[PDB]
Amino acid sequence: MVNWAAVVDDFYQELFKAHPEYQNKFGFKGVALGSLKGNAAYKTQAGKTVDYINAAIGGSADAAGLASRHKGRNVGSAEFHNAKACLAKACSAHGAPDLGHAIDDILSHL
Ligand code: HEM
């Protein structure tokens, strides 16, 4: 089985390194990147992201509902363009399958 938990950990490392102001919208605001793996708010967020990935691949993901929830946090197209790039880098690092089609489905509702 693909280790998506390892992929997701690398994705958040990439996203907040390049766009640290995005981290301000989360319950782990202000926590050093090298301390995220022991942080409770981060472990919850990471688990929900792994879940969405396994739902997208297994065929049950609700992209419209995820997009609507991101609009409700004032998170939109520009942020997801950035995320697509960061997640491609994380997948490559681990020899895991590309997830670009899943991200495009979210963008179609933004
Ligand atoms: C690979 C792209 C992304 C995926 C797959 C993803 C997935 C998720 C999921 C599954 C949730 C939980 C929704 C729920 O509980 O119903 C969530 C919440 C959230 N996302 Fe994203 N997300 C992505 C990118 C982003 C980006 C770029 C931002 C920019 C700041 C962002 C900001 C947030 C915030 C603020 C929440 C709410 C967290 C909280 O409840 O404290 N997300 N996301």
Overview of this protein structure:
It is a single chain. The radius of gyration is 13 Å and the shape is globular. The protein has one domain (1-110): Globin-like (Orthogonal Bundle), CATH 1.10.490.10. By secondary structure, it is mainly α. Helices cover 63% and strands 0% of the residues. It has helices spanning 4-18, 40-58, 63-71, 77-94, 100-107. The site of protoporphyrin IX containing FE has 15 residues, from α2 and α4. Residues 2-110 form the Globin domain. One of its GO terms (molecular function) is heme binding. Homotetramer. Self-associates in the deoxy state. Seems to dissociate upon oxygenation. InterPro entries: Globin, Globin-like_sf, Globin/Proto, Mb-like_M. Keywords: Heme, Iron, Metal-binding, Oxygen transport, Transport.
Keywords, please?
about 110 residues, transport, binds protoporphyrin IX containing FE, globular, Neural hemoglobin, 5 helices, mainly alpha, Globin, monomer, Globin-like
Shape: globular
- Structural classification: mainly alpha
Distance between the termini: 32 Å
Number of strands: 0
Q: State the helicity in percent bands.
A: 55-70%
GO molecular function: heme binding; metal ion binding; oxygen binding; oxygen carrier activity
InterPro entries: Globin (IPR000971), Globin-like_sf (IPR009050), Globin/Proto (IPR012292), Mb-like_M (IPR044399)
Function: Acts as an oxygen store capable of sustaining neuronal activity in an anoxic environment for 5 to 30 minutes.
Family: Belongs to the globin family.
